[PDB]
């Protein structure tokens with residue numbers, strides 16, 4: 001909290017020399033404030049964004065913080081699946097002229113989920129790794145599709161050069177008691193998808209997720225075992 005920095009309704013936390021976690025909150029009746037995490041990556045003389053905030057205005061505040069504190073242009077953005085906490089601020093990115101990327105399935109689902117689709121579609125090989133031709137100049141971002149879990153389109157990102165792997169809403173923390181929203185979840189494949197994420201980034205010691213503070217690899221293990229009980 002003390003290393004933490006605030007801009008508007010947003011909170012920013014530095015996880016690494018070139019990596020920040022952005023956190024936004026949405027008021028949801030019945031629960032109140034719900035936190036959603038994303039990533040900001042500085043790669044040379046440009047900035048890469050992983051996931052939007054809940055809303056356009058909150059996403060706009062991300063961009064202005066980046067402008068004020070990092071003072072580098074945002075080259076691209078990648079969203080991890082077609083839900084509001086990750087894709088709710090797509091209009092703000094496009095208004096700023098930022099190239100946006102997402103799983104082709106996410107872009108296909110986006111209208112059904114009330115989301116604005118990304119400009120470009122990512123495709124993946126059978127082993128889960130992104131097809132390089134669909135993700136040009138992603139720098140240190142290593143995009144990996146672990147398979148159907150939280151949703152059928154969820155993707156994960158590793159930051160090369162760091163110990164950081166981003167699991168999005170697929171991974172819950174090691175002391176969680178639930179897997180959250182299983183409304184659009186694949187109950188049979190979730191456990192294997194979680195373990196595939198861990199195997200894709202075997203050297204990652206800091207696991208960043210959407211709705212919890214950065215945890216260890218225990219978050220991956222715990223998430224898988226909770227998903228085992230789904231089958």
Ligand SMILES: CC1=C(S[C@@H]2CN[C@H](C(=O)N(C)C)C2)C(C(=O)O)=N[C@H]1[C@H](C(=O)O)[C@@H](C)O
Pocket residue numbers: 034083084085086150169170176179180181211
């Ligand atoms: C609602 C949001 C949730 S629930 C989230 C899970 N951990 C938080 C929680 O309930 N605690 C353990 C404090 C809230 C999830 C999720 O668990 O993946 N994602 C979003 C929703 C969703 O992706 O299904 C929508 C709003 O994006």
Ligand SMILES: [Zn+2]
Pocket residue numbers: 081082083150151169
């Ligand atoms: Zn989701």
Ligand SMILES: [Zn+2]
Pocket residue numbers: 083085168169210211
């Ligand atoms: Zn979520």
